[model samples]
Target: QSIDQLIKARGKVYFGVATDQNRLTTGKNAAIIKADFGMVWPENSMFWDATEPSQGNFNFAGADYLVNWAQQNGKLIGAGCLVWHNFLPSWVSSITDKNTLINVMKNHITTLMTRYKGKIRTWDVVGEAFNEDGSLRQNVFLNVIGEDYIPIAFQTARAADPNAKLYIMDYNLDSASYPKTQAIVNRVKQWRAAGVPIDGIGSQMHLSAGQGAGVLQALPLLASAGTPEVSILMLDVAGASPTDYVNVVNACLNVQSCVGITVMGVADPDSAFASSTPLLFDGNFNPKPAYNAIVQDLQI
Candidate 1:
C-alpha cells in the first residue's frame, strides 16, 4: 500500500509533498510522487512571481501543468499563496496608490481561484501576514493596503471559489503558548466571528530536530479557535535521524486535529534549506532513513 493508503487505514491523516513543474515531469521523480503522496502543492508555480510576472498579464502554464498532473493522478492540489509580501513583480512595489494595489490583489485572487475552482482542494490565501508580537508584517500589501488586505483577500477568494478550503499560512507555531501561535489563533477567531469564510489554519512546521516534538500539543489551541483543518504545511528536521522523523510523525498521528502533513521537498538539493538535508528522499529519488522510520512507525 502507498503512504496515503497506509495512513488512511490507520486514521484520517493524509501524506503530501511540495513539488514544482520540473519535478512533476521528471520520470523518476514523478513516479516517486505518484506512489507516495496523496496530495501535492506547487513549490513556486502558484506564487506571485510565476503566476503573474507582469501586471494584468496572468501566466498559468506552470501552475496548470501541476494541476493537470494532480487531476490525472487523483491527487489533491493545493493552490499556494494568493497574496504574499515576497515574489512580487517590479510594478507591484512601484504602485503608490492603495486602491490600485487592492484592485490588483482582488483581480489576482479572483482570476486564479475562478480558473482552478474545483481543481484546487485548498488555498493558502494569505501567507505570512503577522509578526511575533501579534502585529501585522509591514509588507507591501499591509503597508499600502492596510490590515484590511487579509480579509479582503480571503473574501475575494471565497467569492471566486466557495468550495475550496481557505487558509492563513505562517511559520513558527511549534508551541501553543508561543506568542506568534496565539496571534494567529486569535486572528482566525476574529475572522470567523466577523463571518469571513476562513476554513483552516496552516502551521508551516519548518522545524529543526528539537523544535518539532512539541508541535502536537499546539493543536488543541487551534482546534478550540474553530479551525476545521490543521495542516502542517512544510515539515522538515535539520540534522535529523530516522527516529527524529518518526517522532514528528507520531506526534501528528496522535493529534486529532491534524488532517495532513506535507514535506517541504522530496530531496535535499531541492529543499529551500538545502544545506540542512530536510527531506525524506535523497537527490537520487531513493528513500532515506526517514522513509524507513515512517514505514516502521506505521507498521506497513
Candidate 2:
C-alpha cells in the first residue's frame, strides 16, 4: 500500500506546509515542494465563506488553483474542506431553523466531495467539533443537526466520493486525561458501529513546546479500533528558540504509532501576526535555523 509505503519510506512523516497567497507566489512553496515535501494543506482554501459566500452559490476557483498546482507537482494533498464558524457564509449564520441548516450542510458536503472527487487524499471533514470542556461549540451547525452532524458530514462525503478518506480533526487531543478525548473516542466508536466511513484521527497539535509531546503517549488508548494511521499537523508548534526544532522533531520521532506529520508554514507576511510562530523560511526563502534542525532530525 502506498500509504504504508510512504510512511515507512519517509520515517513516518509527510513533510509540507499550510500555504497562503504570499508564500504560494514567493517561490518558497515551490522550493519546499522540490525538497520533496510529501503533502500539502490548503489552509483556508475550501472554507465555507470562500466556497459559498451566498446561499446556493458555490465558488471553488481559488482552492482548485492550489490543488491543481499541487497535483501537477505530484504532492499529496490534505484538503481542509471545513472549519468552524469563522469561514461560514453570513447567510448560513443567519439561518435560524434547524432543518434548514442541516440541508445547507448536506448540500455543501455533497457538492464539494463530488466536485473534488478523488483529488483530495484526506479531508478535515469536521473541525473544532467540541469545546475545551468536552461540550458542543455552540455553532449553528450543532444547533441545527446536533452532534449527529459530525458523522453525517463524513457519511455524506463518503457517499459523494467513495474513495475519499474522512477525518474528524481538532485541537486539544494532547491532554492524556482530558474528558473530551474520552468523549470523542466514544462518539467515534458509536459511528463505527453504525457503519460510518471514518478513516483516521487528525490531531491538530497546535501546541506550545512543552504541551504537546505528552499527548502522543496517550494516543494508544484514544485511537482504538480506528484507522492505524495518525496524521499530525504541526501548525502552531514553534519552539522558544530555533534550536527547539530538534526537540519537536525528536518528540515526533519518539512516537512509534504516528504515521505522518505535516508541519505548517508561518502565516503570510502582510496578515501574519506577531504572536504566530514563524516556522517557515524568512522573506528571502532562507530557512531559519529551526528549518535546518528539522532536516537534520528527519535526516532527509
Candidate 3:
C-alpha cells in the first residue's frame, strides 16, 4: 500500500519526497514519509548556505540529522546541488578571483560529499544553469568561473562519490520545443562526447496541474540526451487533480530510461509557494485525492 512500493512494483525505481527536518516535525508530517516514501531529498540541509555559512567553517548538524534519520528509516537519500546560484553564502559570491572561487567550490564539494560518501544515492552536481532564451544565466558561477564551471561540478562530483548518480538539474524545460530544454540536450550530448561524468537530466518538474502532458512529451527527448537517466528530481503540482498526479507517474512509466519520481512536499504547508497546494497530503496529513489516484494508478 505504500507509494514507494506501488511504484517500485510498476518497475519504477523510487518514490520519494523533497523534504527537510523543519517540516519533518514530531507528528503527522514525519509519519506519512516514513510510511510511503522509499527516498528523501533534504531540501534545505544540503544547501551551500546551510553547509558553510562562512568561508571556511562548515556545519553538518542539520545535514547529519537528516541523513541519519533517512538511513534509520531505510529511505535512500538524494543530495543536491554541490553548486547553485541562490542560497549561496555571500562570501562565496563576493569572490572576484577565478582560482580562489574554484578552490572554495572544490573544498565545499569534497567536504560535503566525503562526509556522506557512500550514503547518498543521487546528487545534482549543478542545477538551474540555463535561462529561458537558452543563454547562460548571469550568476556568480558564470561571472567568475565562466561556462567551464558546469563541467567542473560534474567532474568534481564524480571524484567525490564515484558511485553517486549525478544530474544537471533545472526547471521550465518540460517541453521538447523549449529553448532551455534544447540547450540542456545539446550540453548533455557535448558532455557525453567529452566524457563528462554526468549521468542524467534532472527535470525539477516544478509544474502546475495541466503541465503533465508537456512532462510526458519532454521525457523521451530528455532520455535521448545521450541516453542519460531521466528523473523527476523535484516535482510538485499546484492546483492539482488525481489525473495530474497520475499523468506524471505514467510519464516516467511510459519511458524506458525515465527511472524515478520525487514529490517536493509531504504536506500542504511544506510547499515553496504560499499559493500552492502542491503535495498529496493536506495540512492534517490526510490523503488528498491526488494520493488516492497515485495508489490506484500503481495498483495496475
Candidate 4:
C-alpha cells in the first residue's frame, strides 16, 4: 500500500516527496522515500546557487547524488525549477542589460535541461513570477526583460527538452478567487495560444488547516494540468484539520488535470521547515495521522 503505488494504480501519475542529499545519505529518510514514493523532487541541489555558482562554472554534485539514486532505484524525478528569482547567484541577480540577461537565461536553461533531459519529468521553468496582487514580481527578469522573460523561459525550456513538462510554480495559487490564480491561468493560456510552451501549473499548496476548499474552485480554471505541492503544514498534528490531507488528495483525484501530488517534504523535522510538525511522517520517521488520512483517501 505504498502511496505512489496506490495513487498511480488509480490513474494518477505519482505521489512524490521533496527530498535533499543529506536525507538520502544519512538517515532512514532515504529508505522510507524509496519505499513509499515513485517520484522525488530534489529540494535544493538543482537551484541556481547550487548548479551555477559563478558566471561560467557549473556544479551538479549534489543534484547528481540524488539523481543517481533515482536512476538506480527506478524512480522518476520532479521539480528542478530551472528559472527562479530566489536562490539565484550574485552574477545573475546583478545583471542589468536585457540582451545579456536573455543570453544568460538561454544558456542557463539550455545547459540544465540538456544535461538531464530524460531523467527529469517536470521542470518549474519559471518559479514565483507573480506577486500577491497578481502583478508580476519585480525581479531582475521583469526589470530588464519585462513580461517577455516568462515566454522566453518557457520557450527556451521547450526547445531544450521537448519531453519535460514545463511548469510555473508559486504559492497562494490555491485561492480560487485570488488574482494570482487568475494571473497564472491568464499567462499559461496566452502563451500556449501564442505558440509558447507550458505544460502544467504547480500550485505550492502551502495552506493552513481547512484551506483546501479554495483549491477545488481554482482547479477547474487552471485545468490543462498541474502538480499540487502539498506542504506538511496542510496536515496539522493537533487535529487542526484531520481532513486537510483527505481534501487535498481527493481534490486532485477529482481533477483530471492534476496529475499528482508532491508533499513538500518527507517528515516534519527533516523537511525544509522544522519549527513545527507537518508532514505524513513525524520527527522520528514514523507515519503520522496525515499518512493514514491520505491512505484512507487513496483507498477510495
Candidate 5:
C-alpha cells in the first residue's frame, strides 16, 4: 500500500512532502514523489521572490506547473506561503509608505489566493512572524505596516478563498523554546478572541534527537489553544538515525491534534536543507532507513 493508503487506513491523517517544480515533471524523482506521498508543497516557487518578482507583475510559471501536476496526480496541494519576511524581492524592500505597503500586501494575498481558490486546501497565510523572545520580528511589513499586518494578511486571504484553511507557520516552537512556544499559543488565543480567521497552527517541527520530548509537551498546549488543526510541517531530524525519524513520527501519531506531517523535502540533494539529509529518500530516489522505519511504524 502507498503512504497515503496506509495513513487513510489507520485514521484521518496525511503524509506529505515538499518538492521543487523540476523534480515533479522530469526525473526518477517524479516517480517516487507520486508513489509515496499524498500531499505536495512547492519548496520555493510559491514564495514572494518567485511569485511576484516585480511590483504588480506576477509570474506563475513554476507554481502553475506544480499545481497542475498535483491535480493530475490526485494529490492535495499545500500552498506554501502568502507572507514572509525573507524571500522578498528588491522592490518590496524600498516601499516606505504604510498605506502603499498595505495595498501591496493585500493585493498579493488576494491575487494569489483568488487564483488558486478551491484548488489549494491550505495556505500558510503568515510565516515566521515571531522571534525567539516572543517579540514580533521587525521586517518591512512590521516596520511600515505595523503588527496588525498579520491579521490583515489573514483577513485578505479569507476573503479571497474562504474555503481554504488558513495557517500561521513558524519554527522553533516545539520543545526547543518554551517561551517562544507559549508566545504563539497566546497569540493564537488573542487572535481567536479578536475573531481573526485563523484556522490552524503549523508547527514547523524542525527537530533533532534531543528535541522530541519538548515537541511532545508543546503539542497539548497548542491543541488546548483552540486552533482547529495543528500540523507538523517541515519535519527533519539533524544528526540522527532512522530510529530518530520513527520516534518523531510516533510523537505526531500519538497526538490526536496533529492532523498531518510534511517532510521538508523528497531527497537529500533536492532538499533546501540538504546538509542534514532531512528526507526519506536518497539522491538516487532509493528508500533510506528512515523510509523503512516509517513503513514499519505504519504497519503497511
Candidate 6:
C-alpha cells in the first residue's frame, strides 16, 4: 500500500508536502496525498535570501505561487525558511552594518506576511535561531536585532495576521534533558513571557535509524513550552533500511502527544537526506524495504 493509504488507516487528519519548486513540479504532491496529508509546506518559500535577496526588494513570487496552488486544491498551506544566515542574497552579506540587517529581516517578514496574511495557515516565524545549548546563533538577524529579534519576529508576525499561527522551528533538540534542549525550552518560555503569540513548535525530526528516544523526548519538553499543540515535522527522515521504519513508527507512537507527523518522502534510490543516496524509494518511485515497513506500520 502507499503512504497515503497507511496514513488514512491510522486516522491521520493532517499531512503535508515539503519540497522545492522543482520537486513539486514533478507531481510529487499527487503522490503524497496517498499519505493523507492535509497540509502543504513550501520548503524554501520564506527563506531569508530567497524571498528578499536584496534590501527593500521583497519577492513573494515563489511562495505566492505555492499559496495559490494550495488554495486551488483545497489544502492548508504552511510557509517555511524564515531564518537567518542560511540563505541570503549576496547584497545582504555585503552589508556588514548591523541596523541594515535587522531592517531587512523585519521588512521581509512584514511584507511577506502582509501579502499572504489570510492565505497562510501558519508560519515558521523563526528558524534555527539558537545553538544546541540554547545560545544565540550569531547570525546577521541576531546581531542586528539583538536577542530581542525572536520576540520581535513573533510579535511582527502576529501583527501581520492576527489569525495566523506562529511556529518556532528547529532540529536535533528533541531530548528534553539535553543541555541544548533546555536552552530551546528557555527561549520558548521567553517568547511566551513576552506575550508573543507562539502557537506551536516545528520539531524537524530528521533522524537516523536509531534516533528514537531523542525524538520521543520532544513531547514532554514541548508540553513544558506551554503549548499542547506541536507539529512533528519528520523532515527528511527515513530508516537506514526497511527494518528501521518499524522502530521509527514505534518511537512516534510511544509519544503520548503530537498534533501530527509529516514524513518527508525521497524519490526512491537516494536516501532520505538529499545529500546522500536514496534508501526507501528508487528514482522511479519504487518502494524498497523501508517503504514496505512504513506501509505495514501505518496499516496497524
Best by lDDT: 3
lDDT of 5 by residue, 1-300 (tens): 466566666674678888767887655767876887888888888999999999989989888888998999988889868888878998987899999999999999998888888999889999999998988988899999999999999999989999988999899888634777889889989997898998888988777766765666777777777888878888877743677677667767767767778888777877666787767777787888878877888882
Q: What does the lDDT come to for candidate 3?
A: 0.86
lDDT of 1 by residue, 1-300 (tens): 366677777785578888878987664768877888889999889988888889979999999899999999989988788888778788887877999999999999998899898888899999889898877898899889888998899899989998899999988777888898888898889988998878888888888877766776775666667877878887788965776677667766776767878888788878888788888888777888888778877772
lDDT against the true structure, each candidate: 0.83, 0.67, 0.86, 0.77, 0.82, 0.66
TM-score of 5: 0.95
| Off by more than 4 A, model 1 | none
lDDT of 2 at 74: 78
Per-candidate alpha-carbon RMSD to the true structure: 1.9, 3.7, 1.3, 2.8, 1.9, 3.1
TM-score ranking of the models: 3, 5, 1, 4, 2, 6
Tell me the deviation in Å of residue 163 in model 6.
2.3
Q: Clash pairs of candidate 3?
A: none
lDDT of 4 by residue, 146-168 (tens): 88999999899989899888887
In candidate 5 the C-alpha lDDT for residue 131 amounts to 90
Q: Estimate each model's TM-score.
A: 0.94, 0.86, 0.96, 0.93, 0.95, 0.84
TM-score of 4: 0.93
Clash pairs (backbone) in predicted model 1:
none
Tell me the tens digit of each residue's lDDT in model 6 across 208-251: 65565455565567657775356767454444455444554554
Q: For model 6, what is the error of residue 119's alpha carbon versus the real structure, in angstroms, after optimal superposition?
A: 1.9
Candidate 6 colliding pairs, count: 18
Give lDDT: candidate 1, residue 137: 91
